Amino acid sequence: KVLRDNIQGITKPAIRRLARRGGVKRISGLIYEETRGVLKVFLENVIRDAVTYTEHAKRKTVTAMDVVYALKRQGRTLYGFGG
Amino acid sequence: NIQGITKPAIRRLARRGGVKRISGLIYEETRGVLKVFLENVIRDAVTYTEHAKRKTVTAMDVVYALKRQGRTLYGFGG
Amino acid sequence: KESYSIYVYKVLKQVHPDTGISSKAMGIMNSFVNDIFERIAGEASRLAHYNKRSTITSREIQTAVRLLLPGELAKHAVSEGTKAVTKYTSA
Amino acid sequence: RSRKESYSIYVYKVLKQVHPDTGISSKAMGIMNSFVNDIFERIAGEASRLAHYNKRSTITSREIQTAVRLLLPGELAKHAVSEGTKAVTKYTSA
Amino acid sequence: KPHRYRPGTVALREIRRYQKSTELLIRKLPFQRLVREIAQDFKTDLRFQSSAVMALQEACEAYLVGLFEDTNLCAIHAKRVTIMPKDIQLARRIRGER
Amino acid sequence: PHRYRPGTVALREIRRYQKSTELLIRKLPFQRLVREIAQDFKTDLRFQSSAVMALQEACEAYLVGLFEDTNLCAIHAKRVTIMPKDIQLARRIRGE
Amino acid sequence: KTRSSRAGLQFPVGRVHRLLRKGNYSERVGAGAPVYLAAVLEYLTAEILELAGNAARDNKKTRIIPRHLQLAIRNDEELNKLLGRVTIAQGGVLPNIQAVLLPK
Amino acid sequence: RAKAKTRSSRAGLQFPVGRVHRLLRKGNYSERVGAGAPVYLAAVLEYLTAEILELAGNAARDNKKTRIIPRHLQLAIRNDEELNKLLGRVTIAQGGVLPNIQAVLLPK
């Protein structure tokens, strides 16, 4: 199936919980669209590099190491998935 | 000598950045910030120089000290 | 020592036939060419090392360019590289 | 089939050295593996760039000492440099 | 007569609870479908190891948490308690992401 | 006499300095500051002149960027005058 | 009869290959890699210099000075993203004043 | 033919000097790797692991658990200033955040 408009999957209470973790107490009502936009942009940036690494090795599977490397490029190292 | 960074000089630096009105406590804060940054650059420059057994802190050492911290500097390379 | 002054000058004459470039701007362009070369080579090194390979073919440079350069610059540079390699190989 | 190398057991031995009566789960071992690899890659890469600036072609101990001075900030610099010097001296005397 | 906390206390209880736990905060399947949707824009017919999607989700959650911490600092700076889209945009613009 | 209302001379200075590019810190005070700071790590250091030039260019660019971000913070809080709290917030968010 | 002449490039393919070998970037360097790398460098330099030449003619001068490079770099989205952390000596800044500061 | 003892035993180190030397040689960091560099590097790695593990063990003791889990490593890393500075950017999986609420949020 062709997958479209799944960005609504990030439910409003999910962003609420995320902010509650960060120490935020009162959330506006327009935060939700803005945060979905920011998340979409960040995911595009990570997955572009992950897919690039994967295509380079002539594979059709985006392993965890590709994503760890794509993050490592953008200055956010991720400990725990490297194997 | 940190008082060498004269108040009109900091005023000019702010003017370049698009600032319009400057408080009065700002000057001491900027002197502190500049002191910290200069320490963190000169420490690495001096470490590079001490490594190569030189007593002269050449320009490439300062360029490398910056390049480590992410603030690449063009024009002196070198 | 050795720099890219004359090459930058030739390219400048190729795009703007009647423009000159001062000394300090030439120094800046030298540093910029070295900087981009180091970024691309470093990415090629890391990439050939991930796949347990050992040889920086054109493919690794292509992928490193795809990674570092953002947006349409990537597509244009990749086109240039492929065309240049093809012209060199067939001739 | 195919072996995989990791610093799991060495981390375990060091843990027994500092805290004689504390275990550590598998995921914390994953984090410590990745951390040791991260620090090693930082230090070795910095030493390589440094030994390449001076047109040398060998990572002697001096390069590792200078790289540790650059990377580790503050008290860790002095303590790690002292540990390195002690290890090298005790290694060479035998 | 009914039990009904003043607006503000339930927020603090939730803040303590979610700062004490560590589980993931976004439901797994919506995020997985989002990841596949985005990936299909670049090259079609890609397959994702489950650990890879988990790593992606961990990175996204950590990024959003950091973003909201900095946004909250910005909002408190303006002598408010509510965070607003201009707060997020300022936090990102200072961080250098835009 | 003839005298501008405050604010306009600030704008004229803003445009004048954003048009030009010369250094904004007098050279000798900065040189003596650099030597003073380096005097605590190595005692007999002699700086190449261009090294001090590069140090000064880096410091000016860093401070200009810092004041740009501080100005964004200040305008955020419905003010026009920056304050030490603005600079502290900018540095805190930047990651320092 | 030079490799740069074969590939129709302007940058030196030989020097780029020599640099790849001398820098310890890998054990072995393939034959097409220096050619591709020289082509990429040539294209990036051409892009920057074309933008700088435009910005130089836009203020009535026939020579490029670092202020021009700063303008060309910061006035294009992609190049600005590529050189986001780089400080250019003698650069100044892009002329930009916040709207709120402007009177009325 | 002599009783060969591992280099880690010679240098009084737990970390495996042979493995570190092998990684330096195969990682293409330089053409020729000195004999003292792997020893020095293994010592530094051991010291850093010891530091983090001691702090994490203390933090695990404080909340009355007897096994280190990623939350404990996060709490140990973020609560020491110098270790925080060394590991400023790194995101720990299954890590959570530091318990911290802004004062102005709390009611006056």
Residue numbers in the entry:
A (entry chain f): 20 to 102
B (entry chain b): 25 to 102
C (entry chain h): 34 to 124
D (entry chain d): 31 to 124
E (entry chain e): 37 to 134
F (entry chain a): 38 to 133
G (entry chain g): 15 to 118
H (entry chain c): 11 to 118
What does the study report here?
Barrier-to-autointegration factor (BAF) associates with mitotic chromosomes and promotes nuclear envelope assembly by recruiting proteins, such as Lamins, required for the reconstruction of the nuclear envelope and lamina. BAF also mediates chromatin anchoring to the nuclear lamina via Lamin A/C. However, the mechanism by which BAF and Lamin A/C bind chromatin and affect the chromatin organization remains elusive. The fundamental repeating unit of chromatin is the nucleosome, which contains two copies of histones H2A, H2B, H3, and H41. In the present study, we show the cryo-electron microscopy (cryo-EM) structures of BAF-Lamin A/C IgF-nucleosome complexes with or without linker histone H1.
To elucidate how BAF binds to the nucleosome in the presence of H1, we performed the cryo-EM analysis of the H1-BAF-Lamin A/C IgF-nucleosome complex. The structure revealed that H1 binds the dyad and linker DNAs, forming a “chromatosome”, and consequently eliminates the BAF-Lamin A/C IgF complex from the nucleosomal dyad and linker DNA regions (eand Supplementary Fig. 4). In this study, we used H1.1, which reportedly co-exists with BAF, for the cryo-EM analysis. The overall structure of the chromatosome in the BAF-Lamin A/C IgF-H1.1-nucleosome complex is quite similar to those of the chromatosomes containing H1.0, H1.4, or H1.10, although a slight difference exists. Therefore, the H1 subtype may not affect the BAF-Lamin A/C binding to the chromatosome. On the other hand, two BAF dimers complexed with the Lamin A/C IgF domain symmetrically bind to the DNA regions of the chromatosome at the SHL ± 7.5 and SHL ± 3 positions, and connect two chromatosomes. Therefore, BAF is capable of compacting chromatin together with H1. The linker histone H1 competes with BAF-Lamin A/C at the nucleosomal dyad and induces nucleosome bridging by BAF.
